[PDB]
């Protein structure tokens, strides 16, 4: 039989956690200020052993089996500031001992999460806490909040109620917490919010509920201080009227049923608005059309996500509409046309349009965006123009004039012919033309990209020959030519900066040191699996296999 | 109808709903502790009982029903001595004390089905089940048509109401008789009782200790 | 849940709501000769998703039998018991007697 594992003692810090203790130790020093009894088999907290440590300020009794609480247990700890009873059997504590938890004059943070607490039993257990600042009742079985639920804790400013079964909240339920600033109601069974009267509240989490309708009180005596509202994964059918929240900065409406573009049909209930908004997530909804009045109100908005919606047209044609919009995500919609007016989205750096149905567009749609950098048109069957000469036949989208664009993706665009002046004056650093079977690169199609290009990808194009002079791309670092029929590459006479070279699944037989003389110093990884290599016929590939190459 | 739904989010909610669904049907505030579990494989009697339920053949229906089975008294235990087996009826008697042990109160019973292992039927036949109502008389029950099969098959007859009467006001030994159908124009392993009932440990009418 | 109660309280829970449909008064139709009306009724009430915990108070478990009995990802208050409605109406000059399936709702369940 092994002797007991002792507690790890530090200066006024005693750690008895995960020692399999059945009872609170009584041989601990009286001057202890921090005690950690988590992860043991404590089934009750009596006042007799614990009361000897009057200097305690931080007491953690979490993740035990505590079901009994002696009425005077914690009152002896006159200096106690943090108490953690999380993950215990405290639901039956009131049935075993009367009075519940006692007064806690100095406790600032209390954790009662994961105790299977019930409505009524919670009100019996909770005691007066004048100094309480953080309270956690998460992972319990609370079905409702009454006007007499959170009493005698006026200093409370953070309340965590996530992972409960809350369904009903009485009108004056939070009247006793005027200083409340953070309220978390995530993972609950709320279905409809008729009122919002928390003036001093700043952060509100209503995610993962069934809230079909959300409505705030209108024209308050003072402006509501809410700046962070979360309504994701609900059943919202409408965009909330947030004109009663002037200071709101964050709003996540992702994963709802919102249509643009108040009634609660499942329940049967019916009863510059966002000039300060910064981040708005409307992704995963059922928005089919965007009203003209909707975008105009969203000034100073920096991020707008509309991915995974039923949108078919997006036109920001109003003068100066969405000026500060740094990012616009319209990916995976049914977008057939989009009208980005000139001098409209002036501060737009990222435009995500992959997974749409764009075909014909005005030639200078993306050219009017002043500070456009990232542009993703994957799976959009777009046809670039020839730039200065050989004007594109029909609605060719011009990529030649965007001097600020850096990264462009034309993957899965069924591009048949890449015309010569496609990017003559677009200093791209990355360009992805992969997944375009039958692509015909015209002579000099990568016109002005010799100086700027660093990443190039042509995977899956089935190319039998590469029409671009790769050695003159002095800044190119990563080149992807995988899944093609290429057999020969232009000779590298002078040293270049190419580091990664992917030639997997091609028709390469010989890679001679004549055509690979350059980039011997800069090459680091050379992918070549899937080629009909002539064994010992080339030579340079074997000598490079040692230093400065990969498999 | 316009496309916007990803099954990945739905699956996670369906899984989490199953977590509470099983716990609520079993009336478990928390998963039971595995401390007192005896080491080794499950007993053959328990595994055989679990195989009997999986075999193919009111508010309270949400909650789980405890499963027990009681085999009929052996054929050589006064069944063949006092009760003659004709060309039609086969007599299957059950110990009422053994039934009352598996189901302490008649109200707890939710379903009881007699199960038979048919030997082999190459030709269709119509059969009828009967209950020993009086000391000599037989009460008519359900009838079923047996499809031809070259292999043995298990048959099940719902006898929930009869077993409930046996639990309350039953004799020392009752049983059923299974005879072939006789139209007025015509003058001519072992079976067990599968029981489904509410456990006393989870009975609503008893206050928790 | 008692039907006599369901149709006698304004409570936001799943239940059968009383609704009688008069062809003349409610729909303005006179082409349905028989009957003059019927108790169609309807289901109404939230079936809130319950986020399940491994540990849970014993009495809270009853919520799953009512709010989400099937453990669906998005439970709905849908009818359970349904009854046909036979009618008599004229099509041109020939009278026709036809029975419409699943017209009267007698009980509602979360699904």
């Amino acid at each position, epitope marked *: 039989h092994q002797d007991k594992v002792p507690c790890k003692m530090v200066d006024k810090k005693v750690s008895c956690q995960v020692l399999g203790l059945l009872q609170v130790p009584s041989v601990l020093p009286p001057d202890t200020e921090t005690l950690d009894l988590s992860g043991n088999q404590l089934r009750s907290i009596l006042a007799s052993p614990l009361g000897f440590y009057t200097a305690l300020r931080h007491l953690d009794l979490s993740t035990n089996e505590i079901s009994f609480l002696q009425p005077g247990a914690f009152q002896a700890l006159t200096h106690l500031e943090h108490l953690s009873l999380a993950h215990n059997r405290l639901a039956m504590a009131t049935a075993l001992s009367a009075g519940g938890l006692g007064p806690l004059p100095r406790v600032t943070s209390l954790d009662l999460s994961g105790n299977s607490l019930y409505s009524g039993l919670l009100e019996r257990l909770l005691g007066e806490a004048p100094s309480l600042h953080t309270l956690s009742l998460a992972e319990n079985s609370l079905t409702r909040l009454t006007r007499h639920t959170f009493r005698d804790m006026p200093a409370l400013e953070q309340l965590d109620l996530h992972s409960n079964v809350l369904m009903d909240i009485e009108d004056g339920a939070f009247e006793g917490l005027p200083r409340l600033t953070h309220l978390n109601l995530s993972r609950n069974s709320l279905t409809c919010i008729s009122d919002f009267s928390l003036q001093q509240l700043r952060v509100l989490d209503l995610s993962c509920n069934s809230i079909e309708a959300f409505q705030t009180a209108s024209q308050p005596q003072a402006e509501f201080q809410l700046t962070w509202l979360d309504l994701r994964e609900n059943k919202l059918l409408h965009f909330p009227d947030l004109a009663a929240l002037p200071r709101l900065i964050y709003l996540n409406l992702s994963n709802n049923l919102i249509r643009l573009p108040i009634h609660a049909p499942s329940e049967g209930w019916s009863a510059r608005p966002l000039s300060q908004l910064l981040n708005l997530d409307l992704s995963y909804n059922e928005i089919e059309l965007i009203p003209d009045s909707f975008l105009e109100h969203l000034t100073s908005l920096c991020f707008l996500n509309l991915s995974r919606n039923c949108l078919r047209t997006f036109e920001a044609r109003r003068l100066g509409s969405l000026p500060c919009l740094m990012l616009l995500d319209l990916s995976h919609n049914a977008l057939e046309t989009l009208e980005l007016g000139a001098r409209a989205l002036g501060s737009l750096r990222t435009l995500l349009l992959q997974g749409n149905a764009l075909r014909d567009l005005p030639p200078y749609t993306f050219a009017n965006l002043a500070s456009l950098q990232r542009l993703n048109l994957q799976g959009n069957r777009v046809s670039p123009c020839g730039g200065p000469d050989e004007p594109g036949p029909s609605g060719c989208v011009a990529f030649s004039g965007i001097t600020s664009l850096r990264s462009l993706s034309l993957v899965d665009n069924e591009i048949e012919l890449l015309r010569a002046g496609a990017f003559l004056h677009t200093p791209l650093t990355e360009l992805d033309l992969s997944s375009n079977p039958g692509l015909e690169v015209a002579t000099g199609a990568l016109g002005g990209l010799e100086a700027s290009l660093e990443v190039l990808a042509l995977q899956g194009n089935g190319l039998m020959v590469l029409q671009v002079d790769l050695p003159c791309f002095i800044c190119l670092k990563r080149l992807n030519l995988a899944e093609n029929r290429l057999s020969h590459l232009p000779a590298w006479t002078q040293a270049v900066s190419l580091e990664v070279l992917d030639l997997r699944n091609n028709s390469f037989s010989l890679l001679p040191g004549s055509a690979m003389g350059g980039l011997e110093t800069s090459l680091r990884r050379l992918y070549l699996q899937g080629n009909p290599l002539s064994c010992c016929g080339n030579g340079w590939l074997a000598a490079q296999l040692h230093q400065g190459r990969v498999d | 109808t316009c496309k916007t739904i990803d099954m990945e989010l739905v699956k996670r909610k369906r899984i989490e709903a199953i977590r509470g669904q099983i716990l609520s049907k079993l009336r478990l505030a928390s998963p039971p502790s595995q401390g007192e579990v005896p080491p080794g494989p499950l007993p053959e009697a328990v595994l055989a009982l679990y195989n009997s339920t999986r075999d193919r053949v009111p508010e309270a229906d949400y909650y789980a029903k405890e499963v027990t089975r009681v085999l009929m008294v052996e054929t050589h235990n006064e069944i063949y001595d006092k009760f003659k087996q004709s060309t039609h009826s086969i007599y299957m008697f059950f110990n009422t004390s053994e039934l009352r042990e598996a189901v302490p109160e008649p109200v707890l019973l939710s379903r009881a089905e007699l199960r038979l292992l048919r030997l082999k039927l190459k030709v269709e036949q119509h059969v009828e089940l009967y209950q020993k109502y009086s000391n000599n008389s037989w009460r008519y029950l359900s009838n079923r048509l047996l499809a031809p099969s070259d292999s043995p098959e298990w048959l099940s007859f719902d006898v929930t109401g009869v077993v409930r009467q046996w639990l309350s006001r039953g004799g020392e030994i009752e049983g059923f008789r299974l005879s072939a159908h006789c139209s007025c124009d015509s003058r001519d392993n072992r079976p067990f009782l599968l029981l489904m009932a509410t456990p006393l440990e989870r009975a609503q009418h008893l206050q928790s200790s | 849940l008692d039907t006599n109660y369901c149709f006698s309280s304004t409570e936001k829970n799943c239940c059968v709501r009383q609704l009688y449909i008069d062809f003349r008064k409610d729909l303005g139709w006179k082409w349905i000769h028989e009957p003059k009306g019927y108790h169609a009724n309807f289901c109404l009430g939230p079936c809130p998703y319950i986020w399940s915990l491994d540990t849970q108070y014993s009495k809270v478990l*009853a919520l799953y039998n009512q709010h989400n009995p099937g453990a669906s990802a998005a439970p709905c208050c849908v009818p359970q018991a349904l009854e046909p409605l036979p009618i008599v109406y004229y099509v041109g000059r020939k009278p026709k007697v036809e029975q419409l399936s699943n017209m009267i709702v007698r009980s509602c369940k979360c699904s």
Partner: antibody
Amino acid sequence: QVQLKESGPGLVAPSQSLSITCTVSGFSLTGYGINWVRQPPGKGLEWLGMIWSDGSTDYNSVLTSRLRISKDNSNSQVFLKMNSLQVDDTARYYCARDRNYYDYDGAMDYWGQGTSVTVSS
Amino acid sequence: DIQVTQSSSYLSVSLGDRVTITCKASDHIKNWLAWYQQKPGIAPRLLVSGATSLEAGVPSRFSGSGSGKNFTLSITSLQTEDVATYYCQQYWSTPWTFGGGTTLEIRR
């Protein structure tokens, strides 16, 4: 409005069981608890037990085999059973609805008119 | 169990005078206590739920007070309709327990 009405046999023979049914209206039994309180002809209320909205039951400390409360939510009925009544069991038996302010409350707000139970044979 | 007791089974008082009914609990139930009124022939009616909160429809003349173990139901000015027996019932923990009652009587 809200109503509770008891249904008793009136007379009970000694050593015989007592059965009382508490019919309710205006509220669902799935969301409200029903207490059973009896009052003898002499002064004093005596709580017998209650059936919680989920069907769980708590009883008075002297209950052994003499108390059993069930209900039928679909029919808005609560059933009380009492075995082997004696002379001292002659009393008026009420059923009171629980004030469901909390899920675990206990305060009784709506009482039935009560039923007289006499054990005399 | 939590026993609850009413020391005075009878309390003499005249009309228009102040009346106070005491009811003590065996342990600190902290507010979880109710007050009931029962006419000699009528069924009991809830007067005070919690230690202080008056039920809807109760006259303002009645009032409750107390916390922990000691409690009291006060009547500001006694009326003829208040001549009845009063009970207290704790609900801190099951089983719910009643008091012995306090029947009011007119002094003479």
